[model samples]
Target: HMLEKVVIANRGEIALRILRACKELGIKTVAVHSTADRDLKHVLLADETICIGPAPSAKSYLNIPAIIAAAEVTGADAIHPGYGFLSENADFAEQVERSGFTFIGPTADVIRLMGDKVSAIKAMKKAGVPCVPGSDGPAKNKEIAKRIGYPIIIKRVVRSEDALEESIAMTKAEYMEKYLENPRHVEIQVLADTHGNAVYLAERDCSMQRRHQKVVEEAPAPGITEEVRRDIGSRCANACVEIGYRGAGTFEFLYENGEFYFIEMNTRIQVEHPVTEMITGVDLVKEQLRIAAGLPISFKQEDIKVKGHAMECRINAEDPKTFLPSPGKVNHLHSPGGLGVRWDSHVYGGYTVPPHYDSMIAKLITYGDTREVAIRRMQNALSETIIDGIKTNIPLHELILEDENFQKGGTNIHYLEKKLGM
Candidate 1:
């Protein structure tokens, strides 16, 4: 069924982004918002709007029933769960469909299949994807298990010293394997339509993380050969087709020793998707909408090309040094704009950033002809940007840009931890 109207079931910049895409497609839009977000950009711009609940997300954005009720009232044919909240919830997808609305992501079955860590990996393995070697079922022999490799992780079936003793003693039980001597958090972005069309855009190196959360991300991971990139990208796309995956998804991997070990897949639009778009010239949100509306992707694999380097620094409302929340009124703001610089944000001067949600207030993306050029452009943009009256991690980003290891590329996942001495 062609989507005539859509209800955006989230807020912030992602909501505005989805709204814009719907507008371009001439799809009527309704924005459901919490009381705290009544003046948000997406709310103000939607053709129709509804107040779902109070400021607490549990009663508003995360309130599945309220969201469905808003769609019912607005007569929206579909619901676009923008990136978070109910974006990856299988229950929400099922409920949306049960209530006679299209869930603008994947089917409920697909979401549940890929959402589980163990099941997703097993599926990927069956689809000819390489995953970290672990025990087939239970520990057959510790001596034989050592042959698989040392430093392997011993996963407990249950928490107890006796359980651990029994697992190792019996020499037969389920467990896990692991390695990260020099890991890099790299992921391939895949887009699949309902008509069985699929392609992997390339890879993004999200190694710069704080507490396992990506702080900075770049597309077309540096130092990866085109041959290897093509191989990984194809495998990811094949995995999607094998599993009947639809819409946009990401296959995250723990890359080490030039090998990619399968990790979890994110079945929604990512905050760092703009970096991938910057290099590929693809409007991912638009593609998601198209896929949801039962349309085929306009381009094939040959039409997709990675033309330049792109980097994204998540601008969070937090203390640069200590990394604590710093939500407050945005006294003054000046967004950096120039060639290859894009600032994606809902916050502006005079807007008070509430302390209720994710601290990432904006995403600063820069693109250039080369990785070095991109880095330098990001540096310059960071310098010119100003967000007054709130402690931002801009200073932290500046330090990363100036770091020698970062400029050299191919930095591992532990790069940031070592740099910060954490």
Candidate 2:
């Protein structure tokens, strides 16, 4: 009963995604965008829209002060920071709530706690979760390095490295060292409520990636046994309670050799969430809106059930082979439609693809009675999709779908690389 209107502080398909959910729930919405995105679909569909700033992200999408002012002016009671931009920013959450508007995600403290990779690992470990060993700080360098062994990666403790330093002369920014390996990138989707109830919908295997970014995602991760699945799922649900987590979040993990290791928690709805929704029959965005509005989750753990297989291919505006940005006007367009096929995009014929944001033009999702059926359906859907003015990864998606390993579900993080001979 808390939120009557929401200000979506995001752009592109995700903003439109959230807007549709709000409309179904009988909530009004306002859209905020940069000058570069005034003609975006979300801006056009929203009850009202405000151009917060100019084309540069620093002055608009990421500008905290401008967003707060927009919410205030629109009489928006809540701010839904869709994935990306300031969605996971702890400070932004604090600022939104401090401005007398409900932030439609987790508490700011939870965001801060899970935002740091090192801190998140420690927290998960304390909750009886398994994790890969790593050095939290630069101290005990040699000892930790020897214990963790080679094939390790050094990363900034919080965000990117501004305090970059040599191995021995580290300073300013915090850092972490971990044993690196190519493991399947699996994640568990969980939902929690302020009434002390939580449940893990299921899992997604996002191992088909390039440059460590996802290209294709699927739910009911193909290989794990039921025992292993339940164990990991239960651990994830328990961790939500242990951390006092509220709303929707994902527990990302690196799975290898029958072991699950904690990565970091995304304390906001994820871009890949649609696959989970297709398999579990849950609208994650609507659940977030409900939780933020002070409503208990509609179902308990026993009431939750996982259904048929679901898969999503990220259709990006890029050269299929070179992966370069392909931004321009979409001269012609045709979307695939049929049973179990879903295309989520903000682009249409005559719409200009802006270079200022993500290259993913749309998310092509499909669900079927079985994984095999899902794959076949996706192949047909991909074949039917048509975008005239821009090059897309449609060809690449076709190639991957035809690969024998993918057809048999025997792929890991290195599958795409090995297949491409990269």
Candidate 3:
């Protein structure tokens, strides 16, 4: 609630998202824009509007001092570089604060080393060494037993027989790893802190996938218990914050009933982020900004409903049935309108749906009274939607939704391809 003269960085929906959050919290907003967005509504809604630079977005928005000058000219209290437009550039956040205003969201460790795959893994490993569950050192008998759980493999430094004590030198008992049968990739959605609090929001069962890519996702992962959630979630939250990383990030694991093996840190918010937001009813961007300054997680954590289910069928700019890329110009899109449906599509008629970019043009999310209702809305939403130019995978989603096994809460990561008979 402390931000005042809040400068809204970036444009489109994010500017609007931040503006409203500030308004509700009684914070004044300063809208900064390039010439292209001179007519954008955020400028009109903001308490003050300042022209930053010319129309080319990269030429304007990412220029640190120009934005700083705008805020300084307007006498803003803080700068919020929304979700896009260099929000993850921890250095930019550093510079903004160095210029004497707060940068919304966590203090960045270079965006978890700017989210490099190996960089976060190595740093995060020190947080818990979240992989093969061994003693990691020669351990007491019971510590290893409780920590690693049941079926285990001892990586003996020396070969041994029943007369195994053959050498007088069996000195180093280096490690052990777990035996896994079938593992599911489960996800924990987490929130950060300026006050040393890490809240694991909810879990998503990410097992529904295709070709090693996620196709469908759901939250509070059906059949999850609070017992399992708290144990693994507690560790994930600790490891995440312990690395000196914050903001909305997800922790992933390969699990088989127990052992909680091989946890990995993905250093960002989410693609399927809305699913968790629906079940939790917290504005991730809003909270990231409020605690953008330094509000602890206490206000929201106590309100966890761990609520009803939410699901997403990512609408890609590809062949709806064939799962092939069909990128091209987008002439028209008729998005569905209803209470339970939410579409994060930013496309408009006559925009070039360029090929060199990602196939993920948009996401269609639904929140339900229950999982059944979410499905009902998703199916209903798909039918009412229309997109002109470029094929899409909307039909594939319907086929999956229409299938018997899918409707019954079915299958795993390989099942889509398996069901494809691929």
Candidate 4:
């Protein structure tokens, strides 16, 4: 049987995303929100809405009891964490499953295995995925430093006051291959059903980043050969099967010199998922629902096709230069339109931006036959896009799209920060 009702336990674009999928699948959606999020677009449009608590996330979005109670009261049969907040929090997933409701991502056990630093690394290694060379699980100094080589970042496995410098808890990782040399942030999007099946939806390049967060994301990562994609993708899909994983997940990697080293796995639908959706024509959210309902996934490896190119610009309500959050009523708004442009957002005209949440107000994605068309389309779309009565990073986006290096593709992760002169 299909899942009949779902609790959208998140805010912003993702909440609206789940709502749309639920509606499309004939499933009733129950939107739960904080007091400060009472007027969210998803809350207003959902089949039913519940106020979990006040503005602060812990008292609201992260309040497991309140969210679960909302589901119970609304008669929802499942919970969809639309990323962030308790999305990767294994305890909440365990609670949701134990309370007799479906948790739409991977099982709590899988989430736990990926959430922990030590366990996740070991699992990746066990599955033969290349990862950053590290202490694996706590050890040494001079000898270990020689093994790992110069430029190490420390990670303390544990802590104690039983030493001279009291620094027994530490580990400097090898010189930042991910940071110092400007690695490309590429990730393979994978989906696994409760049944014994898994497939990777190509990959996305999010090398344009700042402060360790992706800015612009594009699917069918530039410069990655078909051979590389297929090889890494198969391994990622295989890894999911090995871990007994389920639903939508991403295997993030730091790509440098045609080599991919695993970073982490986002065990939930990622923020930039729509770009992958545009290129693949796969509704990741619906797949999540179907997988959670214990239905076999809708397709197989041969049935999948990676076509064209897609790009997503994260529209954030923040200053262009300083990057400070700008929360205020959107007195006027004009979203981009026309062929191949998809605007996923919870904000609208007269919608007041709440200060209690992430600043990303929308995701504007464009698809095209080629990466160049996608980039050109995004330029046009951004030019037409408007959000008044509040500052936004629109200006920043325009400049980024027009950059010489960006137009050529494959800029490293630190490109944006260096461009910003930060």
- Top lDDT hit: 4
Instruction: Quote each prediction's TM-score.
Output: 0.94, 0.93, 0.71, 0.94
lDDT of each: 0.87, 0.87, 0.71, 0.88
Model 3 per-residue lDDT tens digits across residues 1-422: 35667998777556766687788888889988876666555676888998888877666777787898988998887888865566777778778878888876556664746266455555556766356555554325434544666454453322232322322124333244454545667788788777777888878877767777887888877667888787777777787566665666777776666545554555555567778889988777667666666777645556676878888888888875667788677878888878988877546676555553356766788988788899889999999988898888888889887877667763556667777884
Tens digit of per-residue lDDT, candidate 4, span 148-248: 65444444322222331233333322212212256799999999997899998999999988898778999989998888888999999899999999999
TM-score, cand. 2 vs. native: 0.93
TM-score of 1: 0.94
lDDT of 1 at 152: 52
* Pairs in clash, predicted candidate 1: 138-173, 139-173
Residue pairs in clash, model 4: 151-175, 152-173, 153-172, 153-173, 154-171
- Where does candidate 2 stray beyond 4 Å? 135-143, 149-151, 154-180
Cα deviation of 316 in candidate 4 (Å)? 0.8
TM-score of model 4 vs. true structure: 0.94
Clashing pairs in 2: none
Which of the predicted structures, 1 or 4, would earn the higher lDDT when compared with the native?
A: 4
- What's the count of clashing pairs in each model shown? 2, 0, 4, 5
